[PDB]
Amino acid sequence: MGKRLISQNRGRGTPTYRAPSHKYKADLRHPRVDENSSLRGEVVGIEHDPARSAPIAKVAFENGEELFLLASEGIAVGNIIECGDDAEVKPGNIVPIGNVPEGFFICNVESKPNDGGKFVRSSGVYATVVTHEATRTAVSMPSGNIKWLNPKCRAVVGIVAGSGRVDRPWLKAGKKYHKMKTRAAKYPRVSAVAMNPRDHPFGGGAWKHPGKPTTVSRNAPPGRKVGLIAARRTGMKR
RNA sequence: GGUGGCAAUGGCUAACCUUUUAUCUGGGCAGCCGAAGCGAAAGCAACAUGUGCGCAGCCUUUUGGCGAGGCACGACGUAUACAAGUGCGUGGAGUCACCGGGGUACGACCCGAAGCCGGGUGAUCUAGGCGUGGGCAGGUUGAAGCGUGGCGAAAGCUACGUGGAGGACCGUAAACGGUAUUGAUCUGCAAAUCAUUCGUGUGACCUGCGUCUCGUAGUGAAAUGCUAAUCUAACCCGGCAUCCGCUGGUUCCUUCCGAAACAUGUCGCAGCAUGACCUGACUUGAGAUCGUCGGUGGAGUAGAGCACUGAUUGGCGAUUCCGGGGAUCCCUCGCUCGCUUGUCAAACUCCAAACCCCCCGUCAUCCUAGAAAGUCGGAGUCCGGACUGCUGGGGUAAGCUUGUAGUCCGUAAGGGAGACAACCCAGCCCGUGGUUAAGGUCCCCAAGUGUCGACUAAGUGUUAAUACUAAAGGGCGU
RNA sequence: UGGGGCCCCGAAAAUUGACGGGGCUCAAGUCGACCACCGAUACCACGGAGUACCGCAAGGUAAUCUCGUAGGAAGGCGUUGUGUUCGGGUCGAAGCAGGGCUGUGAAGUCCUGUGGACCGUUCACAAACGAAAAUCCUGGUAAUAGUAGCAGCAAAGCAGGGUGAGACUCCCUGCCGCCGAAGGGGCCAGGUUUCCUCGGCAAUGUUCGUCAGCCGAGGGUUAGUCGGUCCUAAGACGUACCGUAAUUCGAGUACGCCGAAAGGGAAACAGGUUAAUAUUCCUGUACCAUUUAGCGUUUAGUCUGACGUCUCAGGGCAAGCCGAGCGGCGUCGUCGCGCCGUCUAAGCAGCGAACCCCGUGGAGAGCCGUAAUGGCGAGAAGCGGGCGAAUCUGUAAUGGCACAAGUCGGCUUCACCCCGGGACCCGUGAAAAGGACAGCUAAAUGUCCGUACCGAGAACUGACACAGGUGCCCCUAGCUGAAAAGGCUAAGGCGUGUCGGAGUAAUUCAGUUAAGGGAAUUCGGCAAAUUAGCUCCGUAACUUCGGGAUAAGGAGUGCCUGCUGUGUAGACAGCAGGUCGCAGUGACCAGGGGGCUCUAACUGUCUAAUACCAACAUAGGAGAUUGCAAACCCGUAAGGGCUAGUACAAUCUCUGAAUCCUGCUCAGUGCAGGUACCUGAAACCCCGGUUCAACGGGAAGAAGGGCCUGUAAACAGCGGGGGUAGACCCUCUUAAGGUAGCGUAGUACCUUGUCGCUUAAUUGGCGACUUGCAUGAAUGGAUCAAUGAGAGCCCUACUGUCCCUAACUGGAGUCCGGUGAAGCUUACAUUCUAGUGCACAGUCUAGAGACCUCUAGGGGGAAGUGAAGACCCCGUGGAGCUUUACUGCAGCCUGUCGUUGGGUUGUGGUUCUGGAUGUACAGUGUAGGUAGGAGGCAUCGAAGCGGGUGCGCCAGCAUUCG
RNA sequence: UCCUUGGUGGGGGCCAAAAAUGACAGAAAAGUUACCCCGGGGAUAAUUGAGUCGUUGCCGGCAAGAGUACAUAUCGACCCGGCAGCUUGCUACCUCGAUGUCGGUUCUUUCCAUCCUGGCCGUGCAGCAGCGGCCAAGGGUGAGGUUGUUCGCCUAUUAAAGGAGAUCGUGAGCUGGGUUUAGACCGUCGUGAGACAGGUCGGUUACUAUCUACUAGAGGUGCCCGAGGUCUGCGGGUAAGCUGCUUUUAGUACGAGAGGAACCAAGCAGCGGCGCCACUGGUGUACCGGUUGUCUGACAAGGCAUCGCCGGGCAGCUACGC
Ligand SMILES: [K+]
Ligand SMILES: [K+]
Ligand SMILES: [K+]
Ligand SMILES: [K+]
Ligand SMILES: [K+]
Ligand SMILES: [Mg+2]
Ligand SMILES: [Mg+2]
Ligand SMILES: [Mg+2]
Ligand SMILES: [Mg+2]
Ligand SMILES: [Mg+2]
Ligand SMILES: [Mg+2]
Ligand SMILES: [Mg+2]
Ligand SMILES: [Mg+2]
Ligand SMILES: [Mg+2]
Ligand SMILES: [Mg+2]
Ligand SMILES: [Mg+2]
Ligand SMILES: [Mg+2]
Ligand SMILES: [Mg+2]
Ligand SMILES: [Mg+2]
Ligand SMILES: [Mg+2]
Ligand SMILES: [Mg+2]
Ligand SMILES: [Mg+2]
Ligand SMILES: [Mg+2]
Ligand SMILES: [Mg+2]
Ligand SMILES: [Mg+2]
Ligand SMILES: [Mg+2]
Ligand SMILES: [Mg+2]
Ligand SMILES: [Mg+2]
Ligand SMILES: [Mg+2]
Ligand SMILES: [Mg+2]
């Protein structure tokens, strides 16, 4: 058994690959709202989220529950966040995407209604509402894909705060090191061609090279799915 | 195999019972082997002796007779199914022991690895992740920002001060690291230390304690590094007395005999099997051939020769033929074929030995105190080496390599060569006396300063074989 | 002239050597012959042993018997026990040491001594039955050897006096030393009695020892306040649930519970006391918590606990320093200096800086602030108030002090306390207990565990009284000085980094110095030397504009006298004059510098114990997958990692900063998509077979494959020969044929390629050329400032690297006292030469030498010692790793069955009503299925007709609306 | 023939024929290891040693001829015969329970096939100087640049700057540049792991001497009236010297000139050897002085910092001196 790969080590769940969950502020999700209900809350603070490197808003709701929300750009302390099917479609409000006009920017979008918000959550990203239909509503993802969602899926109106985070180059291994201390990701990473053959499919050889094509089949088993996985194509576009 | 019991109307019992404490006595016929074979099977199913030779033994007129066992036939059962031949079997000897040998399987004469696998142990070291603490002498540089001021029509450009940034600089024997001396040390202070010299020293920093991640797993800024002095799969115990054709060892005496280092097959080439060769026993019963001489046969090697096959040298004579040289092919001529000359042959032969081989006779030797033959028990051995020949083959040669005959060493003393595995005498029980062998006789050193006839002037030489000994060539040296 | 013998020339090798040596000349050589002798275990003779065969035995025969490895065969000896026979022994068994005799021998027996209770023997039978060997095992014990070590990193002792049997070594005094930002002080983990006292010295202590962490005996640890205990952290554990064949196994969830002697945290101090404990005992003066009783009660949910890195202001203060008084000690050749002390806890009470807040105020052709950033009509300055620190003041003030003084001032202040500001983050820097906000008075209670001592050059760990590590973890006085560097000194700890003496060789470890030369040394400037602090002047190529940079290169520097400036001060900066030395950063400390290349951008990481590199990483660049019930990955499952995450995200790869760029090739392999057609298993279905099945075919046809398309920042590739001043048409092209660049390279075989600079001379370096054996673009190309314990070359400086060594210093060595190992070893051994021999001999052969013992010395030889060669081969020995090797197994893709139901239609017959609808030729009539080969109905029904209801040749059977 | 019996379908068997194992007396079968491990082997290679000598180095015989003529002053074809073992091969006898690699360095020694120095002979030798050969191994044979080199090239001296053997002498002497481990890069090869007889950067050199040998120093015993002194010399050893330059002979002999010697004589030098310390230089931790920092209160006198550092230096030792 030429040793297991880094991906298999991470799947094992060892401490080297686990997130420092105790360092994080909140499991960001929409407040739980019953069918045909609404809740209002006011923003009391804007805090740094170590798990995302983007601000989060602390919201005190009418029901006596205090919750951390994924902050949209422009959300300010003292703002009244409304969440409901009848809520005004305004930045920071959590409304169903069936009530959002075409061309509006949404974020923290539920995969299914009441899911808590799955898509469009990183700093600066946003989704655009494209079409409305009777049972489906379509949005353009930050990836460019068109996603057909239930119109009852809730989303906060606006874009995610923290835009331009990666415009500043790391410039230095130490800065990225400090970012990686709060993440599960292993830093730094050794290239596979630099490893021995017992440690990677690409390892070994008198000189550094994979020895086999780096595009691997989608059928390849664990310990073998390395390099370009099921690549449609390779190279820079001609 | 040796020794016994019983014996075709066979032998022996197993478990078990009888124990009155393992014995023992008496039972115990289940079963096994023998008693019928042949055939895949269905199936079918044989001599209580028909003949001959003949050992022992007995008889005998000493040459014969009878002749168990033995040998050779004949006959029969069955398969080959058609036949014909043949195979196997058939005229009652087995069975159970004791004491041995040997094969096979088991740890299998004893010890000797790396490994493979199971279940467990380990992160007091080290690597990485996390929690919570601690630390970084003293200096240097002087980013943005800010203040005031200069040069400008503006655009803008610019000085100083302030400021205190940076995986910034120097630097500590703080801490961490570990360059070079290839210094000390190298049975050390030390199973990695010491001195000097070095790198980092506000950061991807160093570090305490806590905590987590581990064996086909972990950890790794990746060297197969690290995971408790252990890492290209840790450690403990277990599988395990693993296995090996490979290495080492294997313990008292005498006596008798005494090899093979070879062939064929083998994933065979450091092994094994079968055979040759050694050893033991038995059966059988009259010849055998290591040697000679003569004869009947085989020769195709040596040598020789050119008659075949091919090579090979000139001279001489012809092919009015096939062809090289500058229109009557106007005339010049190489091969080709013969008669003489000169040479050859592993794979040429008109010839043709000496050795040798088969057979017959002969002498010789061995043999009833057991020829030849047969059956069975136990092996070792299949790394060889040498000398003398074979101009052995190959090779420039080789103390090379690979054959062959004889003989040796191996496994061979003693005597002699200076010593000498295998060269000479000699194969050797113990003791004594004698005479020789090889070799030697000036001394070392037993026996010749021996004899005759010559040679050598070079200390040549004083060297059987010899892996241990110099040639071609020359000399009015003698 | 030819043929012969012997000799000569031809004829050169390595330690001194070989006719065996001496030597030998009408021979002691050679040749031809001869004579006598010596000389084996051979041969002969005698005697003896065994063997083979024969013989009833007695014995007979052997010229034709007597070597022997592997090996076969026969007979014996011995050990221990059993059955059995017969014995011996305290008048002395076994065993042991030595000896006599017998036997070929294995062995047996006897004698002497020693020993003190058991031992044999016949015939048989057994076995844990015989040792010289296994780098055999266990024990014991040599040589080495009175040898190495008791030196190197901290060179430490001497005098006098004691104690004692004994004194370098134990005690005291003095002198001389060591550490003095650690070798002192405090304490964690760890140790576990080592602590203290007395008594000892066999061992331990690297010597001694009267000493001791050693030995023996006794003693020693006192808590409401110090810790643990309490809280929670990362993270464990338990129960339950669920999984698992099962569990002591497994993730998650729920509930609990643990997890910090360096995080959070209720509260105590000073002095004294012991031999050893002391915030613990005692004195004095305090404080906290709970329970109870009385006196009163919510403000309730907030705050606190509660937080990063860097930087800075203000205030305080332990330590430190200065002047005066007082009290001691030292010095006293002269002087009047130097040192020590001049004290004082918690608690209690009082004041309160900054920040913040409140009330006034009204500030701009601008004012107010700060070290700095700043602030302001959204209300500055100014003026009042509130809240609120460290610390300070008093009290505790009588305790300790030589009941000696004990009284004052000033300066500074880290490395500690308080307080406030600023900057940075793609990094955001814990939680919970507890506490505060309403408590006051009294009484009672405060259990449990630890507590000695070391905390390391002797108390831990590394086998050690170990130069390592743990821990330099946290602390540290004066001068110099930037300083916690280094040096010299306190306090404190030591002379135990536990052998001494002696002073005399070589050699050696580590240092000092060195004429003249100056890298000639060497692979190479390795090593050493040079420089060195601070101030000022001055500083190049190149550059990413940041730097290079301390570039380079120059000048100054001490002491004394008198001053100037800045500043609140501490101090800092500067000037003038005088002056000494070889030298003023005088010691200590403390860069040598420069030029041209290769390479990697850089800081960083690494082979713990031979590789600190150009390797790894890195930021940057690019590609790939995935919309989250995702991609990727772990698990047998239950369930998980990534993930408290969500495309400017995670994961998977490649390349490796910047700068200029990154060309052509999709034939092969890979990947992706498409699947027209081909291939493609099982099940279902159909056919045949089978009284049933097995079975043989057919149809249908998933994934996969063929096949087509895309894709190179996927793996990869980018070629041969000849006509033309070696370009250009063709080729060979079985995808294409090297673009930009670079080029003899870290790649270039030829090769020390050619030329130029560098040198006297350069297989060198650099530059150019380049026919590139075999360069080339993210298998990244070229290039590059800065950086580098990286690799080469050159210049300068420097030098013992060298010419060529010398002297000197300390430690070893040498010699003496004490202590005291280990490693090689079959034996013998004073060798040397040659030969021989398994061809590399101290031992063999022939010579030559050699009297023995001891000491010192460097290492010629002992093919010296260490290690069953790691190179090579062999083994039907392994291991890891690779793959289009063989064979499998996971994972994954897909068909079928089960889970698995209900409706709607579209596809096959399942099952059958109204008609028997059936008809070459002509029909009166439709075969009314083959037919009793002929024989029934009918006005109570049989037709020629409408689109002709079944149908059909607008005919005619069926009585039908007529 | 198929398990109680009969039958059917389907099986099993007997004899023969076909289908293949070519590694052909028959496994269904790819690599890699320098990260390697274990068992062995001198049964078998790298290295030293032995043998051999094709090859290598050095010669010889006959002399074909060339040499204005003339084989033999000089050169020496064809063929033929050798020596050495210093090149490379061949071989597998020794060694795999290890005989430590290359090159250099240091020190000692040997060979002669002689580079110089000494003596000779020939010449196509006037002299100078050559060319060829003979004897001769006493002495000498050096310094540098490149390269790890050996080898070779080059430089300037030099009388000349010979070659080879000693386990390719010499790692219990040194060094570690090269090769010959583990890391990494480039090129090439391979699908790959990995490889290369390319290149490149980096990469641990163990031991207390038992015996023997040698270098020196002692104690004995032998010899011997007892002792002492002075000698002798069997023997051992030596390189105790070797070699240049200049002057002179002499601008002479010789030679047409140009050029240009030799015997004898002198001095100096290089290297070597032995000794010495008046001189000179070094050292000189005796000693004297100056001075920095600090401590002992100051002065004075002292301690410490490498002898603190700096300057000077007698004796002694020493060479760079004699
Ligand atoms: K890994
Ligand atoms: K990487
Ligand atoms: K013929
Ligand atoms: K204590
Ligand atoms: K780049
Ligand atoms: Mg793999
Ligand atoms: Mg038939
Ligand atoms: Mg400034
Ligand atoms: Mg530094
Ligand atoms: Mg086991
Ligand atoms: Mg055998
Ligand atoms: Mg012949
Ligand atoms: Mg013979
Ligand atoms: Mg043998
Ligand atoms: Mg023999
Ligand atoms: Mg003999
Ligand atoms: Mg034998
Ligand atoms: Mg023994
Ligand atoms: Mg000190
Ligand atoms: Mg002692
Ligand atoms: Mg707890
Ligand atoms: Mg001493
Ligand atoms: Mg680097
Ligand atoms: Mg790299
Ligand atoms: Mg050089
Ligand atoms: Mg490209
Ligand atoms: Mg084999
Ligand atoms: Mg590797
Ligand atoms: Mg091995
Ligand atoms: Mg040596």
Side-chain angles (χ1 to χ4, degrees):
Chain A
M1 188 281 314
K3 307 282 284 292
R4 293 157 166 260
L5 298 176
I6 294 286
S7 62
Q8 306 178 276
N9 299 329
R10 177 183 302 101
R12 179 150 177 152
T14 63
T16 293
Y17 306 94
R18 274 186 181 261
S21 306
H22 51 271
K23 287 182 176 177
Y24 303 150
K25 295 267 177 55
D27 192 341
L28 299 179
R29 46 85 165 165
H30 296 143
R32 271 75 186 282
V33 193
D34 284 2
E35 185 186 6
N36 314 122
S37 293
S38 292
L39 77 164
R40 282 181 47 173
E42 82 168 15
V43 179
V44 303
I46 314 288
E47 301 193 14
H48 170 268
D49 184 15
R52 293 168 51 244
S53 295
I56 53 181
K58 188 171 180 58
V59 189
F61 286 99
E62 306 286 20
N63 55 5
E65 282 194 312
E66 60 203 21
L67 203 63
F68 278 110
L69 292 189
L70 188 149
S72 66
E73 175 143 340
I75 188 174
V77 166
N79 289 162
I80 307 304
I81 309 300
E82 285 198 347
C83 168
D85 308 331
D86 49 322
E88 177 188 15
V89 172
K90 191 183 54 184
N93 288 351
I94 300 171
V95 303
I97 56 174
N99 303 338
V100 175
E102 303 172 17
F104 271 26
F105 296 159
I106 60 177
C107 57
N108 195 18
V109 179
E110 291 177 332
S111 184
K112 316 192 324 302
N114 313 119
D115 214 356
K118 305 290 192 183
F119 314 115
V120 184
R121 292 162 59 98
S122 291
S123 65
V125 302
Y126 66 93
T128 312
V129 171
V130 174
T131 70
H132 282 278
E133 295 189 357
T135 48
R136 315 173 310 167
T137 182
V139 306
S140 182
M141 285 284 100
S143 67
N145 303 339
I146 284 293
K147 178 73 173 176
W148 281 103
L149 294 162
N150 192 303
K152 294 300 303 180
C153 288
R154 303 136 72 215
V156 58
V157 179
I159 76 174
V160 183
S163 173
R165 162 168 51 81
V166 304
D167 288 355
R168 191 211 185 276
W170 280 123
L171 206 78
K172 201 178 77 157
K175 184 68 179 294
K176 191 182 179 192
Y177 165 95
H178 291 308
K179 171 150 176 286
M180 299 286 87
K181 294 290 291 185
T182 74
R183 259 61 166 174
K186 175 61 161 53
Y187 187 80
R189 292 293 299 269
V190 185
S191 51
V193 285
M195 304 179 177
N196 293 124
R198 187 182 73 164
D199 285 321
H200 200 277
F202 297 169
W207 59 289
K208 306 276 214 313
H209 72 302
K212 65 204 74 173
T214 60
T215 54
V216 73
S217 178
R218 180 75 77 184
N219 197 5
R224 181 55 188 90
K225 186 163 296 183
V226 296
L228 318 187
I229 297 172
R232 268 62 160 261
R233 56 156 299 157
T234 54
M236 291 202 67
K237 290 282 181 169
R238 308 157 76 175

